[PDB]
């Protein structure tokens, strides 16, 4: 599923990301835009053999288990397949654990490069929430 900008903003708000651990809603919408372009089925194979899965491109080396990644930690205790659903529940649950580390949203490279330091609120403006 490819979410519309406002559609995802509303969904993430329902999923409790409006002000989760100091991060405003716009951060999450912006992150999704640049990490997966709002595509829940997005996957990207990395050099180290790991793969980034879903709307928030969660990595198989540290966060989810896809059974094909060397040195897997599975910090989110969840199969990577669960992060490729049109239902964002699992991706949000895992993203919350990731951001609860001291590194915060810096875990998301696209967010760090295209969102951090910008007017992230702009990503939720002009939306019926």
């Amino acid at each position: 599923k490819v979410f519309g900008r406002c559609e995802l903003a509303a969904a993430m708000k329902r999923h409790g990301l409006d002000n989760y651990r100091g991060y405003s809603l716009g951060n999450w919408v912006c992150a999704a835009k640049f990490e997966s372009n709002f595509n829940t089925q997005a996957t990207n194979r990395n050099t180290d053999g790991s793969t980034d899965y879903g709307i928030l491109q969660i990595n198989s080396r540290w966060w989810c288990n896809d059974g094909r990644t060397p040195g897997s930690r599975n910090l989110c205790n969840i199969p990577c397949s669960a992060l490729l659903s049109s239902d964002i529940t699992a991706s949000v649950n895992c993203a919350k654990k990731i951001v609860s580390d001291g590194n915060g949203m810096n875990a998301w490279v696209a967010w760090r490069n295209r969102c951090k330091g910008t007017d992230v609120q702009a990503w939720i403006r002009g939306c019926r929430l």
Epitope: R14, G16, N19, Y20, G22, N77, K97, S100, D101, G102
Partner: antibody, heavy 113, light 107 residues
Framework: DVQLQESGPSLVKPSQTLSLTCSVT????????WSWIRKFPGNRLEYMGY???????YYNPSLKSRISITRDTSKNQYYLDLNSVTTEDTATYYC???????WGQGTLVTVSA | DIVLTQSPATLSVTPGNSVSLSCRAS??????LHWYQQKSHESPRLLIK???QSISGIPSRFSGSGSGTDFTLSINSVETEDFGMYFC?????????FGGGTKLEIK
């Protein structure tokens, strides 16, 4: 499967440092975030803090920075140090993973002269 | 900090009947409210996560509802094994905080 268990002295004196150990069996401590929670005499629960995968820690401001949570991969266990305890620190201490799925049995520590 | 207020403090019920426990947050916490059950001489047990999400291994009679500042834990047809303490906990802001608890006992 995973198992957690607290260990350490059950009786300590005021002003000393209270130290507890949580032994993890079933998986490496490097694969999760680890926490400490305590229950006071009147069914009052307090989340003390947790240490995440990067080594970063989050401590409850209520502890006034008297707390330290550390890990030891080689022994697959993590710890809780609480400095200058008082009778207000008497409580049942529990270790559990961040998700809340795995908890230790809990251990009562009494602070008394 | 976020203050969680639970009510009633105590609730007596006859096995077979249903009940609902309340947990109110001083400030909005989204859906970041979790429910725990605790029996004497026992460690807390997670029943519901993120307000309404089910937990594998927990009886289906437990369900959670709510968002923002108002949350409820419901038990459809209370069983003897359900008597004990129930606590809500929020994870939207640090420090994580717990409600004062609701004691469920046989009437």
């Amino acid at each position: 499967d995973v198992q957690l268990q607290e260990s350490g002295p059950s009786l300590v004196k005021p002003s000393q440092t209270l130290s507890l150990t949580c032994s993890v069996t079933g998986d490496s401590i490097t694969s999760d975030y680890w926490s400490w929670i305590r229950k006071f005499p009147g069914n009052r629960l307090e989340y003390m803090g947790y240490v995440s995968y990067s080594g970063s820690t989050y401590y409850n401001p209520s502890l006034k920075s008297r707390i330290s949570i550390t890990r030891d991969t080689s022994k697959n266990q993590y710890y809780l140090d609480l400095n200058s305890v008082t009778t207000e620190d008497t409580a049942t201490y529990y270790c559990a993973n961040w998700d809340g799925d795995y908890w230790g049995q809990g251990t009562l520590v009494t602070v008394s002269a | 900090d976020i203050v969680l207020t639970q009510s009633p403090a105590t609730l007596s019920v006859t096995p077979g009947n249903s009940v609902s426990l309340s947990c109110r947050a001083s400030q909005s916490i989204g859906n970041n409210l979790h429910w725990y059950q605790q029996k004497s001489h026992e460690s807390p047990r997670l029943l519901i996560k993120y307000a309404s999400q089910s937990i594998s291994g927990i009886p289906s009679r437990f369900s959670g509802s709510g968002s923002g500042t108002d949350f409820t834990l419901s038990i459809n047809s209370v069983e003897t094994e359900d008597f004990g303490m129930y606590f809500c906990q929020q994870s939207n802001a640090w420090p994580y905080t717990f409600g004062g608890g609701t004691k469920l006992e046989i009437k």
